[PDB]
């Protein structure tokens, strides 16, 4: 039935993730880099009695793991469109809808697993050193932020990959969308006489603040901001079902 | 599965113009037409890849459809058993050990079933694709040229195996492909597509075959011979470019040969043979090229 | 292009075993075998891609070689005219407008010769590949499955154009392709590849002794008919009790019936028994499968 | 004639180089980046009397242009191998050798054109600003360094792509070999009780010092280094010719 078709598609997507060696090469490289950076920064400049603050490691590990997880999600989304096996899944309407459902569920499962991985890396780094332990609420709301970011970008890239059916554009567009705004703001926003106006107007464009809040080691959202983010995710999801059920290949 | 008054158009261009289709008391059906006339458009419309139908399609939910289109779609990176298992779980009702063992054993893919698909050849990919198509356990099977790059022995073996499976499972097949002599071997009925319509529908069940006699002659004499033979006998088919005229079966050649001798026209070659789809296909479609 | 005492081995797998080949008074030759027997290996040896021949090849430097191997190879981002100009400058002596325009016009790709190859279809790219092969100004043309993605009338048109260019300009063609019924229309000789050797070579004009032509005549005409056939051609079997005379196969029946109509003789029946490449190939290859 | 076959292959390869929009997108981006960095760092980090130091512009322009000319050479040499049109060229021995000669000549012309581009960019920067001009012998030595670096790396990658017949692998190994060693060296050489020994032995392996002196603003060599580098280039060329005339597809 539909339940079996969704669970087998999510299960096979998970199986495909757990078998490739690039996943364990990425975790090894990130963990090695993060450990080297944390030890080098804490053991050499000021030279305290081995006190370590965890905000810098939190932010750095979060940013590196997110950019890799974004690429992993884009790869999972565009696998069938690259190989052309997508033409096998667009036979009827219930299968065409279950495909989108299964992709969303796979994104949720990868995000939950990835949050667990982030938990393991941060617990072992904290366990090795000594200092002031963090709180559970930080990890829980961090998990929520992980979910929100990955869902928003995965659905947006899902819509673009359905419209264009080209893969090299998705990879380049995803890299561009995540990485262009932090690069452009210092070199361009301080110039205009309209900059303060543009900065106030930045609270409603989803791209600017989702990318902006990436560097910070804690996220803070207003009620209006939360409302607009959930409304935007719902509109993209509804639009995806409508366009996938109305596009002709 | 029936189609009624299907009309699909691309902008100003019209591809299908009020076509109809139905599996009426026929088990294997062949689809014949030229290149780029809209045969693949018909397969995508029939299978379900196209929603802007502009007709009525009567299908049941309990019946599955397994298909083969333009090129095989497979996971090149993974293995044959992974592909087989994945398409049985994701597309079919489940994975059946006895059923899968029987299909692999009947097709003969067991020696190379555990080696990677990227190490396969072209024919190997089509044979695996046919097994993947049957993996859904469908009620309707639509195939777009399944035997494109195979030797005559291999084509005979694959079609014979497919025919025996048409009795093992309650199956109904539509095959669109060129090289019609492979088609005439195992098919009960063929449909011919021209200008978006099915112009002719020849059905063959028993081997009576409506035997015919072929007379070949040059153009300057072909005009007179067609008129004279239409005035005397009943004429079945004509090909103007090659000067090929195909009257029905005549046991005695004496009255025709005597009349053509006092008529001063003479044939280049005379034989009697069962009519075929090569004759019908060329008769219908030689008008546009030359 | 000749091979004398060629043997090639891959590890413990022997692909070629003492094969000889020579163009003796023939223009079009066909190569027939199964898949993975080492046909493409023969093509690569015949082309120049393989280097470890283990034999002798005698080639004059003045003769040019043009080839097409399994699928077209082109520059995707660039146009067809760019490909034509590039392969004319790189492989041939140069570029000439008259020769390229005559080639382009005869094949028929003029409306879309300025379009991008990315938008072409399979048959259009195959035809363009054949044109690129001709751009070399070759003395010997070697084509590997030139007719796989096109419909029968298009295939016939391409083959007719190929033979016509064989006659206006001196070319020798080697064709390996399936759908052997299309090759048998226009070909001069065929070679069959089995177990690593060229097992059979058949020249169809001269025939084989198994081909027969059956002429049936009246009782009164038997003496005169036998006299005429004894004067003109070879007679194999004569049966007075049957009334049947067997003569050597003739493609055209005009002269034969002219002579008999001049001697007031009208045959009861005429037919020919011949072995085609499908019949010969199946009879030879049934030896290892059945 | 063989002369037309070689000149047409180098000329048409060069024509494909001069006729793309990415070539001008790349020049515009690099020129904008180099001009912004030099102007920003020189006109306000100590409030001078608008003096500009040319070492940073030399090193930065040199680094970007080498990494771009390197990728342009890799793309140029692997275009034909990617699509498999090399089968049409590997027919007779004379064409198989003329192919390699044409590729070498294409490498020489691409290097000369990029050297001229570097010269034009530097002349414009010198024309706009105020300071003390450089010397022509520096530019001639710069031309020679461009030739040696590009020839060496192109022949190495040609040998690797001949052995492997993979294009993605070439792109990864080329980027890996150019950018990993200067990045890896600070984090590892100063650590052992063998670093000085390996450092003295570092003057004979071609890879380490050719890549190391790429980001330097000065470049001078000894006789043994010059003989070893030139000999390595010649041996690679002879080995490539021998493999191209003996490999079977």
Distance of CA D125 to the CA centre of its chain: 23
Domain that holds residue C249: 1-290
Taking CB atoms within 8 Å and a gap of at least 24, the contacts of B246-249 are B246/B212, B246/B213, B246/B214, B246/B215, B246/B275, B246/B279, B247/B212, B247/B213, B247/B215, B248/B210, B248/B211, B248/B212, B248/B213, B249/B211, B249/B212, B249/B213
Cβ-based neighbour number of residue A99 at 10 Å = 19
Do the Cβ atoms of C34 and B151 come within 8 Å? yes
User: How many beta carbons lie within 10 A of that of residue C225, not counting itself?
Assistant: 20
Give the span between the Cα atoms of D185 and B91, in whole angstroms: 53
Give the distance from residue C89's alpha carbon to the nearest chain B alpha carbon, in angstroms.
Answer: 33
Query: Max alpha carbon distance in chain B (Å)?
Result: 74
Residue with tokens 């920067």: D125
Q: Which residues of A126-158 are buried (b: 16+ CB within 10 A; e: fewer)?
A: beeeeeeeeeeeebeebbebbbbbbbbbbbbbb
Measured distance between the N- and C-terminal CA atoms of chain A, rounded to whole angstroms: 26
What burial letters (b/e) apply to D108-132, b meaning 16+ CB within 10 Å?
A: eebbeebbebbeebbeebbeebeee
- For C37, residues 6+ apart whose C-beta sits below 8 A from its C-beta are C193, C194, C196
Count the domains in chain B.
Answer: 1
Which chains sit next to D, with 3 or more Cβ pairs under 8 A? Answer: C
**Which 3 state secondary structure label does DSSP give B187?**
coil
Which residues on adjacent β-strands are paired with residue B270?
B215
**Cα(D73)–Cα(D150) distance, integer angstroms:** 8
Distance from CA of B222 to the nearest CA of C (A): 15
Please, which residues bridge with residue C66 across strands?
C141
Across the beta sheet with C244-247, the strand order is C235-239, C244-247, C212-216, C269-273
**Closest residue of D to C136, CA-based?**
D88
How many CB atoms sit inside 10 A of residue D10's CB? 20
Contact B20, B4 (CB under 8 A): yes
Burial class (CB in 10 A: 0-12, 13-18, 19+), D246: exposed
Contact by Cβ (8 Å): D70, D150: yes
Tokens found for residue C19:
């094969």
Closest CA to B186 of B225, B241, B143, B219: B143
DSSP strands (E only) in chain B: 2-6, 9-10, 13-14, 19-22, 28-32, 56-58, 65-68, 140-144, 173-176, 189-194, 197-203, 212-216, 235-239, 244-248, 270-273
Ordered strands of the B197-203 beta sheet: B65-68, B140-144, B173-176, B28-32, B189-194, B197-203
Q: Which of C182, C252, C253 is best to mutate for the B interface (most B CBs within 10 A)?
A: C253
Residue C43, min C-alpha distance to chain D (Å):
12
**Residue B215, C-beta contacts closer than 8 angstroms, at least 6 positions apart:** B225, B244, B245, B246, B247, B256, B267, B270
Pull the structure tokens for residue A115.
């949050």
Contact D9, D96 (CB under 8 A): no
CA A174 to chain centre: 11
Which of C178, C266, C282 has its CB closest to that of B254? C266
B285 vs C contacts (CB less than 8 Å): 153
Point out which residues pair with B202 in neighbouring strands.
B190
CA distance B246 to B275: 9
Q: Edge-to-edge strand order for the sheet containing C65-68?
A: C65-68, C140-144, C172-176, C28-32, C189-194, C197-203
CA distances from A89 to A158, A202, B96 (A): 16, 40, 21
Three-state SS string across chain C, please? CCEEEEEEEECCEEEEEEEEECCCCCCEEEEECCCCCCHHHHHHHHHCCCCCCCCECCCCCCCCEEEECCCCCCCCCCEHHHHHHHHHHHCCCCCCHHHHHHHHHHHCCCCCCCCEHHHCCHHHHHHHHHHHHHCCCCCEEEEECCCCCCCHHHHHHHHHHHHHHHHHCCCEEEEECCCHHHHCCCCCEEEEEECCEEEEEEECCCCCCCCEEEEECCCCCHHHHHHHHHHHCCEEEEECCCCEEEECCCCCCHHHHHHHHHCCCCCCEEEEECCCHHHHHHHHHHHHHC
Show residues of chain C in contact with B282, CB under 8 Å. Answer: 152-153
Whole-number Å distance between alpha carbons of D37 and D34: 5
Q: What are the contacts of D11-15 at 24+ separation with CB within 8 A?
A: D12/C86, D12/C89, D12/C90, D13/D76, D13/D102, D13/D106, D14/D106, D14/D109, D14/D110
User: Taking phi first (over 0 means left), then psi (-120 to 50 degrees means alpha), and beta for anything else, what does residue C143 get?
Assistant: beta
**From the CA of B30, how many Å to the nearest CA of chain C?**
15
Q: How many residues does chain C have?
A: 290
The chain C residue lying nearest D1, using CA atoms, is C93
Q: What is the DSSP string of D121-133?
A: HHHHHHHHS-S--
| Residue A129 lies inside a defined structural domain of this protein | yes
Q: Nearest-CA distance from B16 to chain A in Å?
A: 16
Contact assessment for residue B79 and residue B114, using Cβ atoms and an 8 Å cutoff? yes
Token output for C80: 């067809």
Instruction: List residues forming the annotated binding site of C for Mg(2+).
Output: 40, 70, 144
B156 contacts B181 by C-beta, under 8 angstroms: no
Q: Does C65 touch chain D (CB under 8 A)?
A: yes
Burial class (CB in 10 A: 0-12, 13-18, 19+), C58: exposed
Q: For residues C90 and C75, what is the distance between their CA atoms, to the nearest angstrom?
A: 14
Does D44 contact chain C (CB < 8 Å)?
Answer: no
Determine the residue of chain C that is closest to B214 in CA distance. C271
Residues B146 and C178: their CA atoms lie apart, in Å, by: 15
Closest to B133 in 3D by CA, of B167, B157, B169: B169
Q: Which of C152, C148, C9 is nearest to C69 (CA)?
A: C148
- How far does A178 lie from chain B, in Å, by closest CA? 29
Around Cβ C220, how many Cβ atoms within 10 Å? 10
Option in B179, B252, B266 nearest C257 (CB):
B266
Task: Indicate which of B252, B259, B269, B272 best probes the interface with C, i.e. most C CBs within 10 Å of its own CB.
Answer: B269
Helix (H) or strand (E) holding B281: helix B277-285
Interface contact B73, partner A, CB < 8 A: yes
Task: Give chains near A: 3+ CB pairs under 8 A.
Answer: B
Chain D nearest-CA residue for C47: D91
> Does B51 lie at the interface with A, CB-CB under 8 angstroms?
yes
Contacts of C246 (CB under 8 A, 6+ apart): C212, C213, C214, C215, C235, C236, C237, C238, C239
Residue D16 lies in a domain: yes
Domain count for chain D: 1
Q: CB–CB of C35 and B289 under 8 A?
A: no
Q: Are the C-beta atoms of residues D150 and D73 closer than 8 Å to each other?
A: yes
Resolution number, Å: 4.3
Residue B19 DSSP symbol: E
Q: Is B44 helix (H, G, I), strand (E, B) or coil?
A: helix
- Give the separation between CA B9 and CA B16, rounded to whole angstroms: 7
On whether the CB atoms of residues C175 and C31 are closer than 8 A, the answer is yes
Q: Is B100 exposed, middle or buried (0-12, 13-18, 19+ CB in 10 A)?
A: middle
Q: How far apart are CA C190 and CA A27, in angstroms?
A: 62
Provide the 3-class DSSP secondary structure of residue D157.
Answer: helix
Cα(A213)–Cα(A144) distance, rounded to whole angstroms? 14
- Residue D219 half-sphere exposure toward CB, CA atoms < 13 A: 26
- Tell me how far apart the alpha carbons of residues B201 and D105 are, in angstroms, rounded to a whole number: 64
CA D153 to each of CA C215, D77, D150: distance values in angstroms, whole numbers, following the listed order: 78, 12, 5
- Closest among D249, A93, A24 to C44, alpha carbons compared: D249
Could you tell me which chain C residue has the CA closest to the CA of D79? Answer: C75
For residue A8, is it within any domain?
A: yes
Two tokens, residue B105: 């054993």
The reply to whether residue B270 touches residue C282, judged by beta carbons under 8 angstroms, is no
Query: Radius of gyration of chain B from Cα atoms?
Result: 23
Residue A178: CB atoms within 10 Å: 20
Regarding beta strands B189-194 and B28-32, do their DSSP bridges make them parallel or antiparallel, or are they unpaired?
A: parallel
Count Cβ atoms within 10 A of the Cβ of residue C267 and give its class: 0-12 exposed, 13-18 middle, 19 or more buried.
Answer: buried
Residue A249 located in a structural domain: no
For residue C173, what are its two tokens?
């063609």
Q: Which of A4, A91, A246 sits opposite B65 (nearest CB)?
A: A91
Length of chain A: 249
Rounded CA separation D63/D215 (Å): 6
Quote the CA–CA distance of A179 and B185 in Å, as a whole number. Answer: 61
> Can you give the residue range of the structural domain that contains A84?
2-244
Contact D86, D167 (CB under 8 A): no
Q: Is D8 on the interface with C (CB under 8 A)?
A: yes
Integer Cα distance of B175 and B46 in angstroms:
12
User: How far apart (Å, rounded) are the C-alpha atoms in residues C229 and C223?
Assistant: 10
Q: Which of C48, C60, C76, C90 should one mutate to test binding to chain D, selecting the residue with the greatest count of D CBs within 10 A? A: C90
Cβ burial of D220 (10 Å; 0-12, 13-18, 19+) is exposed
Are A and C neighbours with ≥3 CB pairs closer than 8 A? no
Four-residue CA torsion sign, B260, B262, B265, B266: positive
Residue B68 · residue B129 · CB < 8 Å: yes
Q: Measure the N-to-C terminal CA separation of chain B; round to a whole number of Å.
A: 37
Q: B271 vs C268: CB contact, 8 Å cut-off?
A: no
Alpha helices in A165-222 (DSSP H): 168-188, 195-201, 206-212
D48, D106, D112: which is closest to D76 by C-alpha? D106
CA A247, A248, B2, B6 dihedral sign is positive
B34 and B49 Cβ atoms separated by less than 8 Å: no
CB contact under 8 A, D87 and C69: yes
- Smallest Cα distance from A206 to chain B, Å: 34
Binding annotation of C: 40, 70, 144
Residue B60: list chain A partners with CB under 8 A: none
Residue A246 with chain B: CB contacts under 8 Å: 51
Would the annotation count B70 as a binding residue? Answer: yes
Task: Pick the closest to residue A151 from A109, A90, A99 (CA basis).
Answer: A109
Are the beta carbons of A170 and A59 closer than 8 angstroms? no
What element of type H or E holds D230? helix D223-244
Question: What CA–CA distance (Å, rounded) separates D163 from D169?
Answer: 11
Q: Where does residue D176 rank: exposed (0-12), middle (13-18), buried (19+ CB within 10 A)?
A: exposed
Rounded CA-CA distance B125/B104 in Å is: 14
* 8 Å CB contact of C49 and D87: yes
Q: Are the C-beta atoms of B275 and B210 separated by less than 8 Å?
A: yes
Which distant-in-sequence residues (6+ apart) come within 8 Å of B150 by Cβ?
B123, B126, B158, C35, C178
Q: Provide the H-helix boundaries in D45-167.
A: 54-83, 93-128, 136-164
Distances (CA, A) of C205 to A69, B27, C26, C190, D184: 71, 43, 11, 12, 75
- Interface contact B74, partner A, CB < 8 A: yes
In chain C, residues with a C-beta closer than 8 Å to the C-beta of D84 are 73
What pairing do the DSSP bridges indicate for beta strands C140-144 and C3-10?
A: unpaired
Two structure tokens written together for A193: 């006489």
Residue of B nearest to A5 (CA): B90
- Torsion angle, alpha carbons of B143, B148, B149, B155, to 10: 70
Interchain proximity B49–A90, CB inside 8 Å: yes
| Alpha-carbon dihedral C271, C276, C282, C285, rounded to 10 degrees | 130
* 3-state DSSP assignment of residue B200: strand
- Rounded to a whole number, what is the distance in Å from the CA of D2 to chain C's nearest CA? 9
Cβ contacts of A7 on chain B, cutoff 8 Å = none
Judge whether B1 and B55 are in contact, CB under 8 Å.
no
B281 at the A interface (CB within 8 A)? no
- The answer to whether the CB of B188 falls within 8 A of the CB of B28 is yes
Chains adjacent to C (≥3 CB pairs closer than 8 angstroms): B, D
- Identify whether the C-beta of residue B280 lies closer than 8 Å to the C-beta of residue B202: yes
Q: Does B124 touch chain A (CB under 8 A)?
A: no
Nearest to B89 among A8, A84, A87 (CB): A8
What is the CB neighbour count within 10 angstroms for residue C207? 15
Contacting residues of C for D249, CB less than 8 Å apart: 44, 49-50
Nearest CA in chain D to C59: D92
B73/A92 touch (CB, cutoff 8 Å), yes or no = no
Contact B151, B119 (CB under 8 A): no
Contact at CB, C152 and B123, closer than 8 angstroms: no
| B48 to A91: CB separation less than 8 angstroms, yes or no | yes
Chain centroid to Cα A226, Å, comes to 17
Question: At A133, phi and psi to the nearest 5?
Answer: -70, 155
Spatial distance between the Cα atoms of C110 and C100, rounded to a whole number of angstroms = 11
Q: Is the dihedral of CA C122, C123, C129, C131 positive or negative?
A: negative
């Amino acid at each position: 039935r539909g339940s079996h078709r969704i669970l087998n598609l999510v299960k096979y997507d998970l199986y495909s993730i757990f078998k490739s060696p690039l996943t364990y090469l990425a975790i090894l490289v990130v963990s090695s880099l993060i450990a080297t950076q944390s030890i080098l920064m804490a053991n050499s400049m000021d030279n305290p009695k081995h006190i370590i603050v965890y905000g810098s490691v939190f932010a750095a590990a979060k940013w590196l793991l997110l950019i890799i997880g974004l690429m992993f999600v884009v790869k999972t989304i565009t696998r069938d469109f690259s190989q052309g096996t997508i033409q096998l899944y667009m036979s009827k309407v219930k299968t065409r809808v279950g495909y989108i459902i299964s992709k969303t569920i796979s994104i949720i499962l990868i995000s939950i697993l990835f949050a667990l991985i982030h938990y393991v890396i941060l617990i072992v780094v904290q366990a090795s050193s000594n200092g002031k332990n963090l709180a559970f609420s930080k990890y829980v709301d961090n998990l929520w932020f992980f979910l929100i970011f990955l869902l928003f970008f995965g659905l947006f890239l899902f819509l673009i990959t359905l419209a264009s059916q080209k893969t090299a554009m998705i990879f380049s567009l995803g890299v561009f969308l995540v990485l262009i705004v932090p690069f452009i703001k210092p070199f361009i926003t301080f110039i205009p006489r309209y900059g303060e106006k543009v900065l106030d107007a930045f609270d409603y464009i989803p791209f600017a603040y989702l990318t902006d809040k990436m560097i910070s080691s804690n996220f803070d959202f207003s009620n209006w901001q939360w409302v607009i983010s959930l409304g935007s995710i719902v509109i993209f999801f509804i639009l995806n079902i409508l366009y996938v059920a109305k596009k002709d290949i | 599965m029936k189609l009624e008054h299907i009309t699909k158009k691309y902008g100003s261009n019209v591809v299908l113009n009020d076509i109809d289709f139905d599996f009426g008391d026929s088990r294997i059906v062949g689809l014949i037409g030229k290149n780029g006339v809209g045969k693949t458009t018909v397969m995508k419309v029939m299978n379900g890849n196209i929603i802007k139908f502009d007709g009525k399609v009567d299908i049941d939910n309990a019946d599955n459809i397994g298909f083969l289109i333009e090129h095989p779609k497979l996971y090149d990176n993974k293995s044959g058993l992974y592909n087989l298992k994945l398409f049985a779980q994701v597309l079919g009702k489940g994975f059946d050990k006895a059923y899968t063992d029987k299909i692999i054993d009947a097709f003969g893919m067991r020696p190379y079933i555990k080696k990677k698909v990227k190490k396969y050849s072209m024919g190997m990919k089509q044979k695996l694709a046919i097994a993947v198509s049957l993996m859904n356990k469908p009620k309707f099977l639509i195939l777009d040229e399944p035997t494109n790059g195979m030797d005559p022995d291999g084509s005979i073996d694959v079609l014979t195996t497919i025919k025996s499976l048409v009795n093992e499972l309650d199956m109904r097949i539509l095959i669109s492909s060129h090289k019609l002599e492979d088609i005439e071997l195992i098919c009960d009925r063929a449909v011919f597509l021209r200008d978006g319509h099915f112009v002719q529908d020849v059905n063959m069940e028993e081997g009576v075959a409506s035997d015919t006699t072929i007379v070949t002659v040059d153009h300057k004499d072909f005009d007179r011979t067609e008129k004279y033979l239409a005035e005397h006998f009943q004429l079945q088919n004509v090909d103007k470019a090659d000067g090929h005229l195909m009257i029905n079966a005549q046991k005695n050649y004496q009255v025709i040969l005597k009349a053509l001798s006092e008529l001063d026209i003479y044939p280049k070659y005379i034989e009697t043979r069962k009519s075929s789809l090569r004759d019908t296909y060329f008769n219908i479609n030689q008008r546009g090229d030359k």
